[PDB]
Amino acid sequence: YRRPWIHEPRATNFFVRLITSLYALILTIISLVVEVSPWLAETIFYISMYGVGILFFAYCYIFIIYPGPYNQLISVLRKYKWFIMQSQHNGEGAGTLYLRLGALFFGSVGIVLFGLELFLCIENVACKKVAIAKMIVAIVFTFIQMHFIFCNSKITVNSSRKIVAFGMMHLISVNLWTWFRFVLAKFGDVATFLTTCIVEYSLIGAAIMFILWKSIGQNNGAQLVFGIVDLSLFSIALGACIIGLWRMRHLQYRLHAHGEVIDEILLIIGLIGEILYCAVGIDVFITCALPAFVFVIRMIQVVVQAAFILTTSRLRCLSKYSMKYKPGKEIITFLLVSNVTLFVFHTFEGYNYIIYAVGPLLVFYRFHSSACLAEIWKHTYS
Amino acid sequence: YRRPWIHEPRATNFFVRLITSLYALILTIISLVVEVSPWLAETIFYISMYGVGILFFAYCYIFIIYPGPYNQLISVLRKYKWFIMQSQHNGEGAGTLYLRLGALFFGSVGIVLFGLELFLCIENVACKKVAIAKMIVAIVFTFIQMHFIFCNSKITVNSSRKIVAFGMMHLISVNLWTWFRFVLAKFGDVATFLTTCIVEYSLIGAAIMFILWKSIGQNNGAQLVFGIVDLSLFSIALGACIIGLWRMRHLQYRLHAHGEVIDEILLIIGLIGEILYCAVGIDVFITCALPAFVFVIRMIQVVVQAAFILTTSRLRCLSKYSMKYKPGKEIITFLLVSNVTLFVFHTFEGYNYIIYAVGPLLVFYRFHSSACLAEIWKHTYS
């Protein structure tokens, strides 16, 4: 108009968005060098990141989500005698019910891990309060974050919209940094299950916090039988995706996107992990045919399934026939069963640095695919 | 409405967007493993990627940009006797004049490199046609791509909009793969200048092709004095950015975004390279104070300058005073001079794998900053 940009809403919106995104980018890059490098520096950094996250959570809980006890005090002071925090809230969450339940489960399994090394610290004679404290803040932050994720609806990112911006970007940085803490190798089956769960939990938390941040300012013989069963499971899932797209071609495009960005981000992360894993396997089996044939089938299946999900998540049965025939349902249920089976099977069955780094990404891709298909089974066919 | 999604425009748009993006993601990931792994496999892959790129370019040139000679033929056949290609075109480019001139320069310096190893192949006795051919297709593809970039306006991505989608994604994959070919170390000053130029050219080409793809479907003592001079140049640029934002606070937010996405992408890539480089330098100078102090100043300067540019690129002098006082111009010119000086100075002056990989990113960040500031000097003050 003629006003300065410091007083133009959509000018101030981007500026805050850009500043918070730059802060998150710097802190995420720094967290990688400090956690992928060859101790107090880390310790104080560790405790600082969790402490700032917990402080932001307390600010949100005291002043935004539950302003009652703060509202009392102002009145209690108004008795021993403007600034009372309204209870504006919402029901729109930043994730699906299945995704948030998975977040609760993976965070619970991460707290089990953190408590395990907490016990192994106290009951040993080599570590220090330095260990206990940081593990306590890890447990506290993780539990608070599970509670916040599972209730990411009432949160009004738009009441304190510049600390919620800085806070959400800091939380994304904390989740990504926690993921980076576990992309490096330090019962072998139970150990790799604990790291995977906390990696998956960090990914879900980062996606949820990013979706919330985006809404700020908005006015809205084993190696034989197992390979055989992987090939069979991949092949039937690969065919079901191809058939399902053919059967579901008569549905209609959605008019309102509902949770399509978080699903896109998580599915692409899982798919990137899957494609690297398959490509690296093909490369190593070439530089050093059953497994190599399985890897090509696995890559084709994961790519076609990613396309199938990302498309059918926008398809709704709104035609008279589409509402009555529910075209493709049995496909969705079959694919969901196959994906859950693959996730479970790859968990109980558990050039080595990419394998460990992308290890949790495979099972996270399977879990996210299941969570999307359950959402598709419900939202498309209503 | 009630129509199938296979016949809904915005449903078919995303589906094609998703399929092409998945193809580019797969091919880019595969290109990394094949080019960052420890020969025909590469050779045939190399020639395939360039050949498909050249085939797409020929399709665009014959059928879209210059359909005249094809239009003749249909008529020439209509004489020796529906399907004549219209000449729809545009003037809206996918990049600024300075960015496209930089692309021409860096591509020219890349062709000089390719011709250098072409000559070193013919006039030697160790390589093969296998080398000549692939180097010839590299030169041909690079020159065609410079011509296409510098004239990325008349291109109607929306005439053959599903091959231009596949083609643009393939070109992005080719540019990213060429970049990946040079993130690995194989006069030392002239050798590192040639690799840097082709990396910068690949980055600019990838950004341009992505912007064009996005528009598909749219209805629109050395180590002492040098450190001292780097610190002085960083400090004055750091202060100028802080002052400039204060002086330019009275301008107005833009109403139409003009080339803000390509600038964002390239600036973030350069900034990510800069932040890693600075963080890794701080880490190594800590694990093994003048240089370390310079690294912190450099990081602060690059981050503040990234914010300054990304903000002032959306600020226009539209107020009577803003149009008359042109607030901040001398800041833009001073910052542009400093950035050009830094780019030139770091070229003639030229834990080792990140250094080489992010090497070209630093000077590309300096060049992109200069190109944006020249754009800012012009677009803001008109």
Specify the DSSP class assigned to residue B289.
-
- Amino acid identity of residue B88, one-letter, is Q
Residue B216's alpha-carbon distances to A16, B13, B66, in angstroms, are 30, 8, 19
| Orientation of helix A290-312 relative to helix B9-36, angle to 10° | 150
3-class secondary structure, B10:
helix
For B171, the token pair is 């070109």
Phi/psi at A149 (5° precision) = -55, -60
The Cα–Cα gap between A200 and A204 comes to 6
Residue A228 burial class via C-beta count within 10 angstroms: exposed 0-12, middle 13-18, buried 19 and up: exposed
The Cα–Cα gap between A328 and A323 comes to 11
3-class secondary structure, B252:
strand
For A381, the token pair is 């066919």
Phi/psi at A118 (5° precision) = -60, -45
Q: What pairing do the DSSP bridges indicate for beta strands A315-316 and B252-253? A: unpaired
Instruction: Answer yes or no: are the C-beta atoms of B170 and B138 closer than 8 Å.
Output: no
For residue A161, give the nearest of A108, A115, A119, A219 by alpha carbon: A219
Q: What pairing do the DSSP bridges indicate for beta strands A252-253 and A315-316? A: antiparallel
Q: Give the closest-approach CA distance of B76 to chain A in angstroms.
A: 42
The Cα–Cα gap between A139 and A133 comes to 10
The Cα–Cα gap between B271 and B302 comes to 7
Q: Give the closest-approach CA distance of A254 to chain B in angstroms.
A: 9
Q: Which residue out of A5, A177, A274 would a mutagenesis test of the B interface target, given it has the greatest number of B Cβ atoms within 10 Å? A: A5
Specify the experimental method. cryo-EM
For residue A269, give the nearest of A372, A364, A164, A380 by alpha carbon: A364
Q: Do A249 and B279 touch (CB under 8 A)?
A: no
Residue B142 burial class via C-beta count within 10 angstroms: exposed 0-12, middle 13-18, buried 19 and up: buried
For residue B151, give the nearest of B161, B143, B140 by alpha carbon: B143
Which residues from chain B sit within 8 angstroms of residue A299, using beta carbons? 26
| Beta strand spans in B233-313 (E) | 252-253
Which residues from chain A sit within 8 angstroms of residue B6, using beta carbons? 249
Q: Give buried/exposed letters for A155-165 (b at 16+ CB in 10 A, else e).
A: bbbbbbeeebb
Q: Report CA torsion sign: B153, B159, B165, B169.
A: negative
Residue of B nearest to A251 (CA): B4
The Cα–Cα gap between A101 and A95 comes to 10
Q: Give buried/exposed letters for A5-32 (b at 16+ CB in 10 A, else e).
A: beebeebbbbbbbbbbbbbbbbbbbbbb
Instruction: Answer yes or no: are the C-beta atoms of B101 and B93 closer than 8 Å.
Output: no
The Cα–Cα gap between B294 and B227 comes to 7
Say which of B3, B33, B279 has its CB closest to residue A29: B279
The Cα–Cα gap between B311 and B315 comes to 7
The Cα diameter of chain B in Å comes to: 82
Instruction: Answer yes or no: are the C-beta atoms of A33 and B280 closer than 8 Å.
Output: yes
Residue A75's alpha-carbon distances to A72, A84, B284, in angstroms, are 5, 8, 55
Q: Which residue out of A253, A264, A272, A276 would a mutagenesis test of the B interface target, given it has the greatest number of B Cβ atoms within 10 Å? A: A253
Report resolution (Å) to 1 decimal. 2.9
The Cα–Cα gap between A310 and A290 comes to 30
Phi/psi at A304 (5° precision) = -65, -35
How many CB atoms within 10 Å of residue B72?
11
The Cα–Cα gap between A85 and A68 comes to 8
Residues β-bridged to residue A315? A253
How many CB contacts within 8 angstroms connect chain A with chain B?
Answer: 109
For A24, the token pair is 């998150």
The Cα–Cα gap between B335 and B234 comes to 10
CA geometry: angle B279, B282, B283, nearest 5 deg: 85
Query: How much is the CA Rg of chain A, to the nearest whole Å?
Result: 23
How many CB atoms within 10 Å of residue B29?
21
Residue A88 burial class via C-beta count within 10 angstroms: exposed 0-12, middle 13-18, buried 19 and up: exposed
The Cα–Cα gap between B373 and B382 comes to 14
Question: Which residues, 6 or more positions from A304, have their beta carbon under 8 angstroms from its beta carbon?
Answer: A238, A241, A242
3-class secondary structure, A348:
coil
For A335, the token pair is 């694919």
The Cα–Cα gap between A136 and A61 comes to 20
The string of DSSP codes covering B203-249 is: HHHHHHHHHHHHTTT----HHHHHHHHHHHHHHHHHHHHHHHHHHGG
The string of DSSP codes covering A133-167 is: HHHHHHHHHHHHHHHHHHT-SS--TTTSTTHHHHH
The Cα–Cα gap between A279 and B45 comes to 15
The Cα–Cα gap between B333 and B178 comes to 34
- Domain-by-domain residue ranges, chain A? 5-214, 222-379
For B204, the token pair is 């600019």
Query: How much is the CA Rg of chain B, to the nearest whole Å?
Result: 23
Q: Do B251 and A319 touch (CB under 8 A)?
A: no
Q: What pairing do the DSSP bridges indicate for beta strands B315-316 and B252-253? A: antiparallel
3-class secondary structure, B76:
helix
For residue B157, give the nearest of B169, B146, B145, B147 by alpha carbon: B169
Q: What pairing do the DSSP bridges indicate for beta strands A252-253 and B315-316? A: unpaired
How many CB atoms within 10 Å of residue B36?
12
Following CA atoms A341, A345, A348, A354 in sequence, which dihedral angle do they give, to the nearest 10 degrees? -120
Q: Give the closest-approach CA distance of A3 to chain B in angstroms.
A: 6
| Orientation of helix B329-347 relative to helix B222-247, angle to 10° | 160
Chain centroid to CA A198: 10
User: In chain A, which residue ranges form alpha helices assigned H by DSSP?
Assistant: 9-36, 40-60, 68-79, 97-122, 129-150, 163-180, 188-214, 222-247, 260-287, 290-312, 320-325, 329-347, 353-379
Residue A82's alpha-carbon distances to A64, A65, A72, A75, in angstroms, are 17, 19, 13, 11
For B361, the token pair is 């990113």
- Taking CB atoms within 8 Å and a gap of at least 24, the contacts of B286-293 are B286/A41, B287/A37, B287/A38, B290/B227, B291/B227, B293/B231
For tokens 């738009």, the residue is A158
Say which of A2, A6, A279 has its CB closest to residue B319: A2
Q: Do A38 and B287 touch (CB under 8 A)?
A: yes
Instruction: Answer yes or no: are the C-beta atoms of B8 and A252 closer than 8 Å.
Output: yes
Three-class secondary structure assignment of A179-248? HHCCCCCCCHHHHHHHHHHHHHHHHHHHHHHHHHHHCCCCCCCHHHHHHHHHHHHHHHHHHHHHHHHHHH
The Cα–Cα gap between B291 and B314 comes to 35
Q: Give buried/exposed letters for B219-233 (b at 16+ CB in 10 A, else e).
A: eeeeeeeeeeebbeb
Locate breaks in chain B with C to N over 2.5 A; list the residue preceding each.
38, 81, 186, 220, 288, 350
